[PDB]
Design an enzyme around this catalytic site. Structure first.
Site, mmCIF file in Angstrom:
data_model
loop_
_atom_site.group_PDB
_atom_site.id
_atom_site.type_symbol
_atom_site.label_atom_id
_atom_site.label_comp_id
_atom_site.label_asym_id
_atom_site.label_seq_id
_atom_site.Cartn_x
_atom_site.Cartn_y
_atom_site.Cartn_z
ATOM 1 C CB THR A 148 -0.958 0.062 1.215
ATOM 2 O OG1 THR A 148 -0.207 0.199 2.426
ATOM 3 C CG2 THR A 148 -1.840 -1.184 1.294
ATOM 4 C CB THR A 149 0.213 4.664 -1.328
ATOM 5 O OG1 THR A 149 -0.241 4.022 -2.528
ATOM 6 C CG2 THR A 149 1.104 5.849 -1.699
#
Ligand SMILES: [Cl-]
Ligand SMILES: [Mg+2]
Lengths: 244, 243, 231, 195, 250, 240, 241, 235, 111
Positions: B30-31
């Site tokens: 995920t970012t």
């Protein structure tokens, strides 16, 4: 991890052989021939130096024959460097026995312990075995004059006459032919040299390509003397038997 | 070949393929982002809501080291936790011996050397995380980003994960439009926007926003989580910008 | 393929196959369900047998008076991890006179499983765990995976055909969360949830295994005739 | 423990060892044999600290018996004595040393000669025609200086030994409850039952 | 973590060859030529200083190294492997001899210790053999002057004269023609320079040639006076100027 | 330390290293054990490709573990020394703590345990050796004969053989040995042992070793002439 | 072919892992240069900051090992920092044990010996870096000593490292042929830095701004790096001549 | 090659699964639990007629209240039995009581997975652990090299296991007497055994609360064999 | 020199009936001539109907009780919640005490 690069030196083949031991013996079969002959009044050790160069210092050299103590010597066949590791261990073991019991070590006991060390390298540790075969020539007051051999497997056996290294098949046949039990040292000296002279890969057997040693009771009264032959002494014994 | 099967093995290029393979695991994650500001730093992360059954606000991903350093990461979450555990040990022994809390550049090298050590042997695996971290010390604010190879630099803004390129582009605009500097409260709002903009690269599942910050003025130099009114204010700011 | 010989090796796409194969052992395991309200937390576990002559493999383990888990996969690995939790719960009590937070319990399991996925020689744990507990911040439910990933949830399920129970709980979320001060009704919801994962077999007296912890309820396990009430 | 004597004569070695085992103000036993056979032609008597004596004797016995089996050969008395000395020489610089004094009487089959070795707990070895440990020596040595001859028979050696025991029974403070006498010669080890 | 390579990386092949030792010898063959000649009153060892770059200062890189005051060493093969061997060789001369007997070891025994170190790299776990062959020249009271060769296997042989490395085959043939048992030290230095010119291709002077002798004692190089028995080191490295003097009368 | 698991399971449920160790035993010289009514006899083959040997000093095939127990073997010679040494040490250790010599069953159980340990220990290979352990328990006149093998399993035998061509001599013993009536005397037991070896050996000269063990530590090795008399007697009865 | 994966000999007597470590050296695509003055030793290196989000002050391949010794690295930054930290520890320990500052050449040897160990021992990989150590030694004067993954090291009159190292090397060779001396005959270090930059510009054929370069200077009793403005001042001096 | 503690793609440990194949090659062992006691019986399987069958020890005492039968690589069981015996006696020393049959089994099963790169490989032997305690009464456990153990009313392991287990499925009920169970083990052993069943090639044992663990004599088993043959011919 | 022991005084008393048992003890804690507490309990409910007191040096007494309480807890875990009998507890405590034979718990223990 590191499993990828492991040769697995201490395993069995499907036939029940130890790969590395067999290959170490193959290595030893190319080494210069060494012969041991046991007589009633002494022992002879003879060995052929590996293809000598004319600029090699011959008198201050030691390749084949080594002294373990005053009563025991060995002839080497294989990697010299490996042999020296084992020789220093054997020399120490002999002094430990003398320190403990105040008596010179019996020949077999020294041989067994050195052979047990080789055995260990074939069963555990994951290291390569020692690429060395010994001929042990020694004396003690129990069995008198004794000849033994040990090889990378750690197996040892006793002999009246024996060869190790190159051309053992041809050498053993010649020894088996001319050897007899009531033999003297001077006769055994002649047999040792005659055998090498026929089994040698060289053109002609000369003083500079040989190491020689005797273990006689030829000292003064009931005591053993080790004689590591000098270059000039090998030259004379080679003429005396009529090889050169 | 076979040069990529073992860690710490150089390929004929001069590359450690196992480390490059670890980077792929980071790119899959995920970012997460980091924004340096006037007198501190701001961290933010994307939390994918896999299911309705996930308890909101109760799967915290941003971690604190000591009392003044914040750490966030993308990739294999357990690997990140292991790295922070080490970071906490490193920071503890520094403070034990030298009294003062560990400086950020000093702390950055402690993690760097540890991660680099996991590229030296085939008996260990490289870290499957890129770690964005930083805080406030005696020399002011510092932001860092550390990679599986052990490589790290100081940053004005940092981003990693599946939406790193979207976030990087948005970060570059902030650096250009604010040469004199960005404030701490602004950076929190911008962080929210950038996570929402970076969520376009992971838009199947909807997500939960999580922000933290260190600031000399706003948080008194200590690491704190953004919660309640200040969090909702940042969410609303981000919601207004996407539409 | 070439990158699944050990846990120390990454695949070209950044995958750890040994960890994924360990994850596969959980899917083969028997189904178990977890769910909680604000007052109580419940574990429901379908036990499995070798044959009709054999006993049913015990799925639920107690860790402390206020905490415990259910397992799915390699049972010996669950024994090792549950034993570690018992020690950590106990260390917290002896040293700090403090009941171990359920969240810290998860953090400790995560870090223990992780070390096994980064070193040569070792292997990942081959089991998934559902930890329930009641601490100073109310009721809790955790889901442990041997990749290291731990997740706090209102409800969940792991094992074979766990997707059926997980969908049901996702629908029932709003109902069962507000079952406060009523143990029997929260269990009923859990028993109805695990029933969505059943095929051909049904819940019998020596097949079902239920556990509960809550505000004024220590972690206690129900087996045999004690679960006949809920069939 | 206390009294252990040894006399080497023409064709044998004779060891006398007290039978009393005392602890506190009680003689617990009056028939104790303070010796172990190390090999068929080697006998070791011992005296010293309680527990240590037997533990050490049996440890040496085990080692010599192991050697005998391994080599199918009996070690010479000289060789055994040197082994024992080294063990005590190690012991004295240990954390807790063996406080044991020994006499080693053996018949060397290769030399056809009896041999008596006296070794104290420090590892101090000496070959002697006659030996003793503890306070016994303070009486017996001077007595044997006078009466001992090197060419004596076994029977003459036993009478010479009786003379020592009589003197000890007359002048020693403690009751040592007589002695067990054993003879080591070419035919091995045997015990004199009526002394 | 930890060294998991506890197993041998050098093993016997079916033909009986020890591959890594053979390959190490191949690395020695690639190496620059070095040689040694024994005279009646001394020993000479020499080699070419192959410069990696003209900007590099070749004086800082010493191929010929002092091991003891009366023993020197030169090599052919991998320089780094040689450097660490010299460090270990110097140390072992003290730990296993001088700190025990209060005097420096004789040539043959120091050689023996170096050989032991190289043999262990042939058998021990997780290591390759050393990629060098050494020539060790030295003097001691009871053996006089001596010259030894040490190979990657750990084997060592005494020589009247020999050469190792790139052009060793041709160099050994050259030495066989010129060597006799009545050679004085200066004659041996002269022959050493002649033999080395054959193998060297580029510049041939005191700056590209490294040469040392084991000869008479050097009281001037001792560093102190007052002890009659201490007469100075027999090992001396010939200067750049001293080499060029002999190259004129070549 | 070298850790590698050398002895491991294969898909079909076999430990190949243990099974390959059995092949080494099959290569070794033949050894036979026959127990009578009041004795046990251990017979051993010696290959005759080795002339110019020194039989005085060459290691004997039968080894004394204690004064009342003996051990013969088939397989790797170097490996057997390690087992014999350990067994001899344990024999003296048992006397020291229990104040009583080992039983033949106990000594066998120890040796077998050592062999087993080497089949699931890291860094080691199994012993390429099978043993025949024979003797008499202390103060007991019942003969004892046991066998061990690389895997670690051990068992008691009325009569048994191991080594090369052992399946031939086992065939011989299976029909010639009566359980209801074992060899009543020493002569009968030695003869049956020599007969069984003569099915395999070659010549009855310096190829056969015989060792007789009787109760109360009564062990003696037969000489060439003594064995040759059995060989001469058997061949004359055969021509019929 | 597992002889290419670990540091063991190949049939032709080569260590492929060591050779591949040499190729990792140029992975950063940076060129370095070192020269000696009368009183000083100057080292310069290219500085490339591609990402706009980077803090350019933290991007550096020059290190202050001790007060007197400086080190520039050609290779990846993780290995560079690994080598730097170790060198710092080694220099500090040397001072504590032996009572004087570790010389540049002795540190180079020590780091080279460590590199040699990685080429012989299997479990340790070589570092993919070339370490250039510089100082003004109190005995030997201005000093440049360089280490590589093979464990090789040697002193230098001057030196260069990187992808376009050969062009820089010959450029310097031709100057020392002309000047007939071992160093830059110059009084101040400022002009020695100007020489270094000038000859790098000629060899590489590129122009440099203040942020394109990184400069380290060693004088007696201290080694220091120059700031952007210190370099800018230096670039202005070259341009006005 | 490959790691010892490696998982297969199906989520199983290779070495554990391979050790299970070794156990299938082993001789048959059967256990039956009743309210009057637990019976254990094994196939001896002598490799040759010269082998003295009474020295084949495949049924073994752990404590007075716990017995054990084995199948597979039986040499591997020695250290397991040693551990079990020590565990049982040690617990009695620490707690002045008999140790629970389940707790004993659990202690043995903890050894199972202590292998890797600890011992080099898993055990190649399965155990049937039968016993009695005051809490849970008469119990029978099947301990595998996977580290897993199941309680059983009746269980067969070894080469004839799947055929014998199906037979035990039909024959077992909760009201079996001890005598009925003894005959049932003999009956099922005779069915799956290669050679003809008698007192020399098969062995019986039991554990009761009153008399503890007892291995039956060859004379006692022979009468039960004769009693079994007569009852089958009687209908 | 540092003395690791102390005397916290107090006294305890245990009596057994036909179908019950009592374990009493005063609540005073002291050092030398001072009073530390007028109410500091030293008789504890350890679970499974076992009460216990370790009187003498309080630090050693508290440590021992703490360890036995913990021993009871692990007995349940390892042996299927089995009740620890009074005789089994006694034997367990013997091993706790003797484990420190060469650096003892200075307490008189009664259960
Ligand atoms: Cl160094
Ligand atoms: Mg004395």
């Amino acid at each position: 991890g590191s499993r990828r690069y492991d040769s697995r030196t201490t395993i069995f083949s499907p036939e029940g052989r130890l790969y590395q031991v067999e290959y170490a013996l193959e290595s030893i079969s190319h080494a210069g021939t060494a012969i041991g002959i046991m007589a009633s009044d002494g022992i002879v050790l003879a060995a052929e130096r590996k293809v000598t160069s004319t600029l090699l210092e011959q008198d201050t050299s030691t390749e084949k024959l080594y002294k373990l103590n005053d009563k025991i010597a060995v002839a080497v066949a294989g990697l010299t460097a490996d042999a020296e590791i084992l020789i220093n261990t054997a020399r120490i073991h002999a002094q430990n026995y003398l320190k403990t019991y105040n008596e010179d070590i019996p020949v077999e006991i020294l041989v067994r312990r050195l052979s047990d060390i080789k055995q260990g390298y074939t069963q555990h540790g994951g290291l390569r075995p020692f690429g060395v075969s010994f001929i042990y020539a020694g004396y003690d007051d129990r069995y008198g004059y004794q000849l033994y051999t040990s090889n990378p497997s750690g197996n040892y056996t006793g002999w009246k006459a024996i060869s190790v290294g190159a051309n053992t098949s041809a050498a053993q046949t010649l020894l088996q032919m001319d050897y007899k039990d009531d033999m003297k040292v001077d006769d055994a000296i002649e047999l040792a040299l005659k055998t090498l002279s026929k089994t040698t890969d060289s053109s002609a057997l000369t003083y500079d390509r040989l190491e020689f040693a005797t273990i006689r009771k030829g000292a003064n009264d009931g005591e053993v003397y080790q004689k590591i032959f000098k270059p000039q002494e090998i030259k004379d014994i080679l003429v005396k038997t009529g090889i050169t | 070949t076979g040069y990529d099967l073992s860690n710490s093995v150089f390929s004929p290029d001069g590359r450690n393929f196992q480390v490059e393979y670890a980077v792929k695991a980071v790119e899959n994650g995920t970012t997460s982002i980091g924004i340096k500001c006037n007198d501190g730093v701001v961290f933010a992360v994307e939390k994918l809501i896999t299911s309705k059954l996930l308890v909101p606000q109760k799967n915290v991903k941003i971690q604190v080291v000591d009392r003044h350093i914040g750490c966030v990461y993308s990739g294999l979450i357990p690997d990140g936790r292991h790295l922070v555990n080490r970071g906490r040990e490193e920071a503890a022994s520094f403070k034990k011996l030298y009294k003062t809390p560990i400086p950020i550049p000093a702390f950055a090298d402690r993690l760097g050397q540890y991660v680099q050590a996991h590229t030296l042997y085939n008996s260990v695996r490289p870290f499957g995380v890129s770690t964005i971290f930083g805080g406030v010390d005696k020399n002011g604010a510092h932001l860092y980003m550390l990679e599986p190879s052990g490589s790290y630099w100081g940053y004005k803004g940092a981003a990693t994960g599946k939406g790193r390129q979207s976030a990087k582009a948005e970060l570059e605009k902030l650096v250009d439009h604010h040469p004199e500097g960005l404030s701490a409260r602004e950076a929190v709002k911008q962080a929210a926007k950038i996570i929402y903009l970076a969520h376009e690269d992971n838009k199947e599942k909807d997500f939960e926003l999580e922000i933290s910050w260190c600031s000399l003025s706003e948080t008194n130099g200590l690491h704190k989580f953004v919660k309640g009114d200040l969090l909702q204010e940042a969410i609303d700011f981000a919601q207004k910008e996407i539409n | 393929n070439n990158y699944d010989g050990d846990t120390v090796t990454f695949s070209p796409t950044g995958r750890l196959f040994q960890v994924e194969y360990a994850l596969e052992a959980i899917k083969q395991g028997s189904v178990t369900v977890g769910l909680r309200s604000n007052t109580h937390a419940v574990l429901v576990a379908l036990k499995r047998n070798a044959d009709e002559l054999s006993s049913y493999q015990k799925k639920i383990i107690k860790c402390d008076e206020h905490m415990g888990l259910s397992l799915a996969g390699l049972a010996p690995d669950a024994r090792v991890l549950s034993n570690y939790l018992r020690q950590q719960c106990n260390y917290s009590s002896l040293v700090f006179n403090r009941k171990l937070a359920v969240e810290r319990a998860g953090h400790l399991l995560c870090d223990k499983a992780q070390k096994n996925t980064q070193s040569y020689g070792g292997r990942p744990y081959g089991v998934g765990l559902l930890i329930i507990g009641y601490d100073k911040s109310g009721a809790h439910l955790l889901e442990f995976q041997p990749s290291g990933n731990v997740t706090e949830l209102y409800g969940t399920a792991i094992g074979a055909r766990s997707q059926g129970a997980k969908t049901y709980l996702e629908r029932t979320l709003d109902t069962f969360i507000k079952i406060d001060g009523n143990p029997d009704e929260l269990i009923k919801a859990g028993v109805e949830a695990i029933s969505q994962s059943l095929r051909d077999e049904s819940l019998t007296v020596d097949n079902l295994s239920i556990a509960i912890v809550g505000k004024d309820t220590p972690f206690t396990i129900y087996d045999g005739e004690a679960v006949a009430k809920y069939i | 423990m206390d009294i252990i004597l040894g006399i080497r004569v023409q064709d044998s070695v004779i060891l006398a060892s007290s039978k009393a085992v005392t602890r506190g103000i009680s003689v617990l036993k009056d028939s104790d044999d303070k010796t172990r056979q190390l090999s068929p032609h080697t006998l070791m008597s011992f005296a010293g600290e309680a527990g240590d004596t037997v533990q050490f004797a049996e440890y040496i016995q085990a080692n010599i018996q192991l050697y005998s089996i391994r080599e199918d050969y009996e070690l010479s008395p000289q060789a055994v004595s040197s082994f024992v000395r080294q063990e005590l020489a190690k012991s004295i610089r240990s954390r807790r040393p063996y406080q044991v004094n020994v006499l080693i009487g053996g018949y060397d089959k290769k030399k056809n000669k009896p041999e008596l070795y006296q070794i104290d707990y420090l590892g101090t070895k000496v070959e002697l025609p006659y030996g003793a440990h503890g306070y016994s020596g303070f009486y017996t040595f001077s007595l044997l200086d006078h009466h001992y001859r090197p060419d004596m028979t076994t029977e003459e050696g036993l009478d010479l030994l009786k003379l020592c025991v009589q003197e000890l029974e007359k002048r020693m403070p403690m009751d040592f409850k007589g002695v067990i006498v054993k003879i080591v010669d070419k035919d091995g080890i045997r015990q004199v039952d009526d002394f | 973590m930890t060294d998991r390579y506890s197993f041998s990386l050098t093993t016997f092949s079916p033909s009986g060859k020890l591959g890594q030792i053979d390959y190490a010898l191949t690395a020695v063959k690639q190496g620059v030529t070095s040689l040694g000649i024994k005279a009646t009153n001394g020993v000479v060892i020499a080699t070419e200083k192959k410069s990696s770059s003209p900007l590099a200062m070749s004086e800082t890189l010493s191929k010929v190294s002092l091991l003891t005051p009366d023993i020197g060493a030169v090599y052919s093969g991998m320089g780094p492997d040689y450097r660490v061997l010299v460090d270990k060789s110097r140390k072992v001369a003290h730990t296993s001899y001088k700190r025990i007997y209060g005097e420096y070891p004789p040539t043959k025994l120091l050689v023996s210790e170096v050989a032991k170190i190289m043999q262990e790299a042939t058998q021990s776990g997780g290591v390759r053999p050393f990629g060098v062959s050494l020539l060790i020249a030295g003097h001691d009271e009871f053996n006089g002057f001596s010259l030894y060769q040490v190979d990657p296997s750990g084997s060592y042989f005494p020589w009247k004269a020999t050469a190792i490395g790139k052009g060793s085959v041709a160099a050994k043939t050259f030495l066989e023609k010129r060597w006799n048992d009545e050679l004085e030290l200066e004659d041996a230095i002269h022959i050493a320079l002649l033999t080395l010119k054959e193998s060297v291709e580029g510049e041939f002077n005191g700056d590209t040639i490294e040469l040392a002798i084991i000869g008479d004692e050097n009281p001037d190089l001792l560093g102190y006076t007052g002890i009659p028995t201490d007469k100075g080191p027999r090992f001396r490295k010939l200067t750049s100027q001293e080499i060029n003097d002999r190259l004129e009368a070549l | 330390g070298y850790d590698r698991a050398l002895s491991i399971f294969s898909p079909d449920g076999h430990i190949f290293q243990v099974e390959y160790a059995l092949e080494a035993v099959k290569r070794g010289t033949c050894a036979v054990g026959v127990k009578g009514k009041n004795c046990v006899v251990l017979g051993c083959e010696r290959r005759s490709t080795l002339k110019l040997q020194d039989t005085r000093i060459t290691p004997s095939k039968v080894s004394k573990i204690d004064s009342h127990v003996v051990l013969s073997f088939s397989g790797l010679n170097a490996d057997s020394r390690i087992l014999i040494e350990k067994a001899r040490v344990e024999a003296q250790s048992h006397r020291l703590t229990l104040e009583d010599p080992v039983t033949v069953e106990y000594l066998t159980r120890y040796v077998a345990g050592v062999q087993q340990r080497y089949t699931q220990s890291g860094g080691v290979r199994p012993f390429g050796v099978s043993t025949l352990i024979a003797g008499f328990d202390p103060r007991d006149d019942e003969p004892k004969l046991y066998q061990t093998e690389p895997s670690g399993i051990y068992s008691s035998w009325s009569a048994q053989t191991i080594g090369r061509n052992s399946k031939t001599v086992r065939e011989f013993l299976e029909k010639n040995y009566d359980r209801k009536e074992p060899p009543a005397t020493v002569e009968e037991c030695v003869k049956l042992t020599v007969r069984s070896l003569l099915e395999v050996v070659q010549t009855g000269a310096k190829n056969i070793e015989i060792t007789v063990v009787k109760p109360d530590s009564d062990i003696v090795a037969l000489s060439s002439e003594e064995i040759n008399q059995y060989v001469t007697q058997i061949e004359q009865e055969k021509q019929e | 072919g597992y002889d290419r994966h670990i540091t063991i000999f190949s049939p032709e007597g080569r260590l492929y892992q060591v050779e591949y470590a040499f190729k990792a050296t140029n992975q950063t695509n940076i060129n370095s240069l070192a020269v000696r003055g009368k009183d000083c030793t100057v080292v310069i290196s290219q500085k490339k900051v591609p990402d706009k989000l980077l803090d350019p002050t933290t991007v550096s391949y020059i290190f202050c090992i001790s007060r007197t010794i400086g080190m520039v690295v050609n290779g990846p930054i993780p290995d560079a920092r690994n080598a730097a930290l170790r060198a710092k520890a080694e220099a500090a320990e040397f001072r504590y044990k032996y009572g004087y500052d570790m010389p540049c050449d002795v540190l180079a040897k020590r780091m080279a010996n460590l590199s040699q160990i990685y080429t012989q021992r299997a479990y340790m990989r070589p570092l993919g870096v070339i370490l250039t150590f510089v100082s003004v030694d109190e005995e030997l004067g201005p000093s440049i000593y360089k280490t590589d993954p093979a464990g090789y090291y040697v002193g230098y009159k001057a030196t260069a490292t990187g992808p376009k190292q050969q062009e820089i090397t010959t450029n310097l060779e031709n100057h020392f042929k002309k000047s007939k001396i071992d160093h830059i005959n110059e009084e101040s270090w400022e002009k020695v830095v100007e020489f270094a930059i000038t000859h790098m510009i000629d060899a590489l054929g590129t122009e440099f701004s203040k942020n394109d370069l990184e400069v380290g200077v060693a004088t007696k009793d201290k080694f220091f790096t120059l700031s952007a403005e210190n370099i800018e001042e230096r670039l202005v001096a070259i341009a006005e001549q | 090659d490959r790691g010892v503690s490696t998982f297969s793609p199906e989520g199983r440990l290779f070495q554990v699964e391979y050790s299970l194949e070794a156990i299938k090659l082993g001789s048959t062992a059967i256990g039956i639990a009743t309210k009057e006691g637990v019976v254990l019986g094994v196939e001896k399987r002598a490799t040759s007629p010269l082998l003295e069958s009474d020295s084949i020890e495949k049924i073994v005492e752990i404590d007075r209240h716990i017995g054990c039968a084995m199948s597979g690589l039986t040499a591997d069981a020695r250290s397991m039995i040693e551990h079990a015996r020590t565990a049982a006696v040690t617990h009695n020393l620490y707690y002045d009581e008999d140790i629970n049959v389940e707790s004993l089994t659990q202690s043995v099963c903890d050894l199972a997975l202590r292998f890797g790169e600890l011992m080099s490989r898993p055990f190649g032997v399965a155990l049937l652990i039968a016993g009695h305690d005051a809490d849970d009464g008469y119990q029978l456990f099947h301990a595998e090299p996977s580290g897993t153990f199941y309680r059983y009313n009746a269980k067969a392991i070894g080469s004839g296991s799947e055929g014998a287990q199906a037979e035990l499925l039909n024959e077992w009920h909760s009201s079996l007497t001890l005598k009925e169970a003894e005959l049932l083990v003999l009956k099922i052993l005779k069915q799956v055994m290669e050679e003809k069943l008698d007192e020399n090639n098969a062995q019986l044992s039991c554990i009761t609360k009153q008399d503890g663990f007892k291995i039956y004599d060859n004379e006692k088993t022979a009468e039960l064999i004769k009693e079994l043959k007569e009852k089958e011919a009687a209908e | 020199q540092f003395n690791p022991y102390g005397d916290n005084g107090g006294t305890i008393l245990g009596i057994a009936g036909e179908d019950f048992a009592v374990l009493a003890g005063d609540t005073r804690n002291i050092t030398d001539y001072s009073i530390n507490s007028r109410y500091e309990p030293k008789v504890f409910d350890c679970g499974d109907n076992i009460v216990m007191s370790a009187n003498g040096f309080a630090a050693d007494g508290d440590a021992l009780v703490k360890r036995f309480k913990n021993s009871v807890k692990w007995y349940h875990f390892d042996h299927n919640d089995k009740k620890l009998s009074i005789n089994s507890a006694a034997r367990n405590i013997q091993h706790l005490l003797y484990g420190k034979r060469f650096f003892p718990y200075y307490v008189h223990t009664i259960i």
